[PDB]
């Protein structure tokens, strides 16, 4: 019984909060890699109604 959804790690999501604000200040016209990554995963999924 898969019985909900354990969490595991937000530590790692606060190490990410680091490097976002790092690269943001270093840049300050060009655009983000985030939305490239988002599009790749949304694409690599099935296009089904399943």
């Amino acid at each position: 019984l898969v019985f909900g959804g354990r969490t595991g790690n937000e530590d790692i999501i606060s190490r990410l909060q680091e490097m976002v604000a790092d690269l943001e200040l270093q840049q300050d016209s060009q655009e983000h890699f985030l939305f490239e990554i988002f599009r790749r995963r949304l694409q690599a999924l099935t296009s089904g109604w399943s």
């Binding site: 019984l1 898969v2 019985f3 909900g4 959804g5």
Partner: protein, 89 residues
């Protein structure tokens, strides 16, 4: 096969419901207009005939949300509750 698949479907519905609240709606649709697959799905949603913990948890609260949504014809819920109560050597 529609037991192992239906299990993987309701697993995901719930782990999504959790990071949300208020009923992953893919499943609510599959309810009214996939009635056969709804019953082949809704049976692994009632697959908790197990140690029901002291504290209501993921599956428990999801099933709670369904029965408050006025789905779950009461036959299957009553049955669910009952099952859970449970020389050569």
């Amino acid at each position: 096969e529609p037991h192992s698949q239906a299990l993987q479907d309701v697993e995901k519905a719930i782990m999504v419901f959790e990071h949300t609240g208020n009923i992953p709606v893919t499943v609510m649709e599959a309810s009214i207009f996939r009635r056969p697959y709804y019953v082949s799905h809704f049976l692994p949603a009632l697959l908790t005939p197990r140690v029901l913990p002291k504290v209501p948890d993921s599956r428990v609260a999801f099933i709670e949300s369904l029965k408050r949504a006025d789905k779950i014809p009461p036959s299957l819920y009553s049955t669910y509750c009952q099952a859970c109560s449970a020389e050569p050597l």
